[PDB]
Design a binder for this molecule. Sequence first.
Ligand SMILES: COCC(=O)Nc1c(Cl)cc(C)cc1OCc1ncccn1
Ligand SMILES: [Zn+2]
Length: 140
Amino acid sequence: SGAIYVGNYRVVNRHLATHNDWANLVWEDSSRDLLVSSTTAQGCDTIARCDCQTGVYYCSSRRKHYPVSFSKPSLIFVEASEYYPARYQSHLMLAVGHSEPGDCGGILRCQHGVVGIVSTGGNGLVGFADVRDLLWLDEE
Ligand SMILES: COCC(=O)Nc1c(Cl)cc(C)cc1OCc1ncccn1
Ligand SMILES: [Zn+2]
């Protein structure tokens, strides 16, 4: 589990969104595994605006933050889980890093701020849904 809290937005994995998220919906995209809902309080996270390929992510199944190198956001074939059929995920970055299902929502961050959240992994893979292209998270 986990979310990004930027401005009056809450960014979560679409597959982990609650009824309150869906009832206060701003934007969602199944191909990216992302959903954004509105919040009453302002958040403290800042979004990175960059092309970094190194950063640090939080792994709840280890209670640890790990430094990683990660690929650029791409369209990458993702095998079945309980939430989607084997399908093509978009805006996804991969790293070698330990991963299990409930890890989704952990933040990946670089020197500029929040890069994305955990979404996929296995087999020593961890996939991050990128948020750096969502420039509107910084306004309104
Ligand atoms: C074995 O069931 C699939 C599963 O839940 N795997 C998975 C794992 Cl190990 C870890 C995370 C955080 C997400 C995951 O799910 C998305 C996903 N499905 C498949 C392949 C890669 N990423
Ligand atoms: Zn960066």
